[PDB]
Amino acid sequence: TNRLVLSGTVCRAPLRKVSPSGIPHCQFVLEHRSVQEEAGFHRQAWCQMPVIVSGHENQAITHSITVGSRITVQGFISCHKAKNGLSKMVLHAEQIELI
Template identity: 50%
Template sequence: MTNRLELSGVIAKDPKRSQSPAGVPHCHFVLEHRSYQREADLPRQVYCYINVVSSGKGLQVLTQDLAVGVHTKVAGFISYQTGRNGIGKLVLHADHIEIICSGD
């Protein structure tokens, strides 16, 4: 089955970096996407926030320059996660991160 998502947008919340007990580095951030798409031959403004996590030493270098306002393209798979509060959400597990513009 296919599970692949590519999305561009702006970093909306400061990235939070952590390390698992096994020593795997993680970076969590929120991506805000806004664009115009066509649906039923009509223009439509689309907007979403999505939680993103990148894991592993290979992506650690790429996440060092992430900050609020940075235009970024991410790609990876999506997964459903339930938080400690019992509320579920979709999370994009990024295996590709590309900074489009630093936002300065």
């Protein structure tokens, strides 16, 4: 099992492109903030989660998203070795809601 459902606000301009092999992809960052109850305590959960929406199916849906847009994404997480060398945890969207 690998399923993450996360809501947040797009905090970085959506980078749209198509792979040299014809794969449409949209990348952006999702900023999440919430109050969480853990072991009886109230703590804040926060993260700026990189999100990638690949494939023709979800490309149109993203057109409505820009910096400031609030969305809820469902997909799987996976780690990637960025150019910075460090490891980058990113959410591969399978589903996206615009409100």
